[PDB]
Amino acid sequence: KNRAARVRVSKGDKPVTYEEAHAPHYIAHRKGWLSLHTGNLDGEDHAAERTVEDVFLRKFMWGTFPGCLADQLVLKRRGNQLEICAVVLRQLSPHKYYFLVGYSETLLSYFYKCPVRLHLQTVPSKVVYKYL
Amino acid sequence: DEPWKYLESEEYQERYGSRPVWADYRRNHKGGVPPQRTRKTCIRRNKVVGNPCPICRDHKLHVDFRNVKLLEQFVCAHTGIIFYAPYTGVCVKQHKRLTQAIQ
Amino acid sequence: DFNDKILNEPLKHSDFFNVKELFSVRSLFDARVHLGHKAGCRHRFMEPYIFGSRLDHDIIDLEQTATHLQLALNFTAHMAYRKGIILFISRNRQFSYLIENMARDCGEYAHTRYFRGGMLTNARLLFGPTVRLPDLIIFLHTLNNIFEPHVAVRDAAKMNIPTVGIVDTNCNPCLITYPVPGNDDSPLAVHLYCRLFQTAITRAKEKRQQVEALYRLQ
Amino acid sequence: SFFTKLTADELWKGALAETGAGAKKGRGKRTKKKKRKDLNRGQIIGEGRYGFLWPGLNVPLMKNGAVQTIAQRSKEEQEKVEADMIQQREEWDRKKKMKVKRERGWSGNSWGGISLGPPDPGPCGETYEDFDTRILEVRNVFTMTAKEGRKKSIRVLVAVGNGKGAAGFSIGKATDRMDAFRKAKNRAVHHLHYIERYEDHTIFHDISLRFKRTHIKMKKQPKGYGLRCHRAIITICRLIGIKDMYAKVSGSINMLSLTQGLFRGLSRQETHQQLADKKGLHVVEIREECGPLPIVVASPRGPLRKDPEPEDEVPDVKLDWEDVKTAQGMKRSVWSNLKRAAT
RNA sequence: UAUACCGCCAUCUUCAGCAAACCCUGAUGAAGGCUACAAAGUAAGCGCAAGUACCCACGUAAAGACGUUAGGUCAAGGUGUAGCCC
Ligand SMILES: [Mg+2]
Ligand SMILES: [Mg+2]
Ligand SMILES: [Mg+2]
Ligand SMILES: [Mg+2]
Ligand SMILES: [Mg+2]
Ligand SMILES: [Mg+2]
Ligand SMILES: [Zn+2]
Ligand SMILES: [Zn+2]
Numbered sequence: 001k002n003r004a005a006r007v008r009v010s011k012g013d014k015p016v017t018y019e020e021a022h023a024p025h026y027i028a029h030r031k032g033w034l035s036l037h038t039g040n041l042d043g044e045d046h047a048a049e050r051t052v053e054d055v056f057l058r059k060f061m062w063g064t065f066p067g068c069l070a071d072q073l074v075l076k077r078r079g080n081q082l083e084i085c086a087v088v089l090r091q092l093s094p095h096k097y098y099f100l101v102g103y104s105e106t107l108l109s110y111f112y113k114c115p116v117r118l119h120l121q122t123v124p125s126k127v128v129y130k131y132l
Numbered sequence: 133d134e135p136w137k138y139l140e141s142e143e144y145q146e147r148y149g150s151r152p153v154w155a156d157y158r159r160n161h162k163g164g165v166p167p168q169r170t171r172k173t174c175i176r177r178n179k180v181v182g183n184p185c186p187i188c189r190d191h192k193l194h195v196d197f198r199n200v201k202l203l204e205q206f207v208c209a210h211t212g213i214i215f216y217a218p219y220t221g222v223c224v225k226q227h228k229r230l231t232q233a234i235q
Numbered sequence: 236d237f238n239d240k241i242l243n244e245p246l247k248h249s250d251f252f253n254v255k256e257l258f259s260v261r262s263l264f265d266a267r268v269h270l271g272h273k274a275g276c277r278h279r280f281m282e283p284y285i286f287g288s289r290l291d292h293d294i295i296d297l298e299q300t301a302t303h304l305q306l307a308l309n310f311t312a313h314m315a316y317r318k319g320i321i322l323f324i325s326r327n328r329q330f331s332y333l334i335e336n337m338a339r340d341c342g343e344y345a346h347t348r349y350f351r352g353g354m355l356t357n358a359r360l361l362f363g364p365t366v367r368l369p370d371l372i373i374f375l376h377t378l379n380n381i382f383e384p385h386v387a388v389r390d391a392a393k394m395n396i397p398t399v400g401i402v403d404t405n406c407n408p409c410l411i412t413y414p415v416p417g418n419d420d421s422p423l424a425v426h427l428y429c430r431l432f433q434t435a436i437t438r439a440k441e442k443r444q445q446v447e448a449l450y451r452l453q
Numbered sequence: 454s455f456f457t458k459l460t461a462d463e464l465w466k467g468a469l470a471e472t473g474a475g476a477k478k479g480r481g482k483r484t485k486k487k488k489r490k491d492l493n494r495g496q497i498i499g500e501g502r503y504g505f506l507w508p509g510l511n512v513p514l515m516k517n518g519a520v521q522t523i524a525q526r527s528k529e530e531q532e533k534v535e536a537d538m539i540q541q542r543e544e545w546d547r548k549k550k551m552k553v554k555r556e557r558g559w560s561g562n563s564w565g566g567i568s569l570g571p572p573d574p575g576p577c578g579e580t581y582e583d584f585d586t587r588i589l590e591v592r593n594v595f596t597m598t599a600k601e602g603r604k605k606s607i608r609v610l611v612a613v614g615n616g617k618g619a620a621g622f623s624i625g626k627a628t629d630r631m632d633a634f635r636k637a638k639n640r641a642v643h644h645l646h647y648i649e650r651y652e653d654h655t656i657f658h659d660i661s662l663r664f665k666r667t668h669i670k671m672k673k674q675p676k677g678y679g680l681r682c683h684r685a686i687i688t689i690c691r692l693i694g695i696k697d698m699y700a701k702v703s704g705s706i707n708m709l710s711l712t713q714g715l716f717r718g719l720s721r722q723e724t725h726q727q728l729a730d731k732k733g734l735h736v737v738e739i740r741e742e743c744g745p746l747p748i749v750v751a752s753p754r755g756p757l758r759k760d761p762e763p764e765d766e767v768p769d770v771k772l773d774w775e776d777v778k779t780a781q782g783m784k785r786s787v788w789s790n791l792k793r794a795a796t
Numbered sequence: 797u798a799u800a801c802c803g804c805c806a807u808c809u810u811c812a813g814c815a816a817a818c819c820c821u822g823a824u825g826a827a828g829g830c831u832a833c834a835a836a837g838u839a840a841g842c843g844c845a846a847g848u849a850c851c852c853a854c855g856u857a858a859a860g861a862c863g864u865u866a867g868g869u870c871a872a873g874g875u876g877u878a879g880c881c882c
Pocket of ligand 8: 419
């Protein structure tokens with residue numbers, strides 16, 4: 001019995017999404033990686049820095065868009081430009097949404113001295129994969 | 133109000149409805165059968181005791197011989213004998229006042 | 236209100252669909268319906284229906300047989316004229332083909348295969364929320380191969396469904412509404428019952444069609 | 454550190470400790486329970502220590518058709534906001550933790566006199582609001598299993614009734630109390646027993662019977678008598694709609710068997726119309742309030758019998774020495790006639 | 797303080813059962829629900845299984861639920877409670 005990135009089977013009143021429902025040994029088999037970079041490949045370097053910076057990015061953005069997200073993020077780093085993709089809910093105002101979008105993008109750019117962009121996809125209620 | 137029109141008033145109906153007054157009251161006591169003698173009185177030195185009976189908690193009500201449709205609420209319409217105070221949920225003092233008023 | 240009048244009109248009349256035209260004690264004796272199992276296979280509640288015994292066998296009272304069969308045909312025909320759902324049961328494998336085929340000739344439905352646990356009680360969960368359970372049950376064989384009361388009579392007694400089973404000396408006619416004493420085992424009697432039900436329900440259906448056509452005219 | 458920090462749900466789990474040793478075996482704890490709370494839902498995302506005024510999220514963006522500008526909330530206004538937010542949090546916590554008043558039924562910490570409201574609507578659609586529900590008793594049944602040992606299974610017994618002579622009992626077993634309540638309620642509403650009554654408040658005649666070493670003796674009574682019987686039978690009498698009778702239980706005291714035998718008797722009791730139709734005579738009631746006047750109750754639907762019944766003298770009848778004592782009056786007991794509660 | 801815990805794993809497991817939700821039997825008790833030439837069981841869902849990785853479809857890996865051992869770990873890290881807070 002191993003407990004690793006999995007949900008305990010309940011009576012069937014727990015909405016669960018794809019990535020957190022599926023096991024961590026289904027990553028390459030029935031999932032995709034949240035981030036995409038080449039530091040893991042051979043010949044590259046700075047992989048530890050990549051991991052630290054993307055963890056801090058995910059934490060900071062989760063906490064500066066709190067209560068609206070309903071799933072993990074998608075990171076897409078093509079050379080220099082960084083791209084973020086999020087799924088959120090539509091309870092707060094587009095005013096606040098755009099304000100925080102610009103705020104976070106400017107902060108990330110000024111911190112990492114890197115061109116950054118981020119996109120968000122609206123959902124009325126978080127999609128559920130199954131009831132476990 | 134000293135007259136008996138507080139009963140005909142609308143607050144009485146919404147507060148009670150069709151049931152009698154004693155039907156709503158409930159006694160807190162020891163286990164099983166309650167005591168055979170109710171409390172002596174519900175008010176003392178212009179002070180009310182916890183868990184008072186309904187006729188005592190509702191100060192607007194008045195024990196008067198003339199409030200007929202209130203008096204005959206306790207004594208059964210089917211049996212002329214009055215109910216006892218442990219049944220009606222009221223204390224012995226106001227129960228005796230009610231007995232003398234009904235007589 | 237006239238719809239209720241039409242629904243109630245056949246009630247006041249006795250033998251209104253002419254169900255007596257079908258059966259006669261001659262035909263019953265020819266089909267050997269009067270037979271019964273041995274006295275060892277006798278049953279208490281079946282005692283009063285036995286006319287007598289001979290050679291360790293049982294004989295059915297044919298007057299009572301005809302009375303109960305008349306009542307059964309009348310009830311089934313009333314329900315057919317009212318479009319009340321009918322459902323046949325014959326757990327006997329000896330006649331499943333013929334019974335399903337006469338059910339096809341009638342238009343009504345049947346279940347001769349193995350009966351599943353709680354098929355009637357839990358039918359909502361099995362089929363769906365909105366399902367019209369049948370309004371009348373009939374039994375060409377009340378007992379199963381193990382000689383046990385088929386669970387359908389119990390289910391009907393519970394859910395207030397009327398039942399009409401042909402009862403043999405081994406059967407339990409207590410829960411049955413219109414139990415018909417007879418010979419469950421003989422193929423002649425089985426075919427007779429099937430043809431009688433064919434005629435009855437088909438006459439009821441065609442007469443309902445006639446009456447509704449007459450009212451469309453009027 | 455900030456990198457060491459992490460999301461809330463796992464902290465809440467680690468703090469509440471719902472599972473891991475305490476919850477299993479049913480040992481639990483000594484009445485200590487950490488209440489769940491959500492801090493993100495409470496405060497709006499805008500405010501902080503430095504009270505910058507945000508036109509994007511904190512302040513409306515446009516005022517008088519003029520774009521706003523970033524500004525400073527003075528320290529007095531900051532203290533006002535802090536004070537009113539403290540007040541709001543205290544009010545939220547007050548509304549959160551409060552009393553719970555389930556009306557006292559038979560006694561405290563007992564599920565006897567409490568009603569769960571009418572049954573739930575059916576799937577096809579069947580409102581049973583006319584029905585009222587009551588919980589007769591609750592118990593903690595235990596059976597053991599191979600690997601996990603003792604299994605706790607809440608069994609409950611419930612009754613339901615109109616107040617119109619129609620009612621039904623049932624029982625429900627489940628691991629959860631509310632689930633058992635729901636199951637028992639559904640089964641009771643689906644399994645109903647109807648019984649007739651004479652004049653809306655009495656049984657047709659007194660009955661003495663037994664069921665599984667549980668002797669029952671119910672006695673018809675006149676008007677204004679009340680219900681001086683067991684508390685369960687009083688509750689189900691309220692459900693049925695009868696207002697007065699007497700009853701006594703002798704032998705064992707097992708409320709389920711009591712109810713089975715009681716409904717059996719109340720179902721097997723004979724109506725007076727049925728009695729007249731069976732015998733072939735006119736039923737005649739006589740009262741103590743009314744003088745020597747025969748009040749015809751019912752007549753046989755069929756033809757009346759010509760010959761009346763013969764004089765039945767010294768009939769062979771089995772009765773109870775207790776009733777004999779109570780009738781002769783020599784019996785004495787402090788526990789018989791008490792000024793008990795209302796009905 | 798692992799006898800508050802989260803997180804992470806040993807164990808039977810070289811297992812295959814676990815089960816929301818309904819119905820039925822036992823006089824409406826704890827409990828049980830199997831007979832296929834078939835007699836009251838129906839089953840969401842999980843797991844097993846299947847497929848996926850290596851050289852295949854076998855094999856090896858992986859996976860291996862509900863739960864026992866208050867199993868180990870407040871010393872990966874955090875956290876409830878109790879303390880030091882010259
Ligand atoms: Mg392992
Ligand atoms: Mg108490
Ligand atoms: Mg331990
Ligand atoms: Mg496998
Ligand atoms: Mg492995
Ligand atoms: Mg240990
Ligand atoms: Zn007083
Ligand atoms: Zn036979």
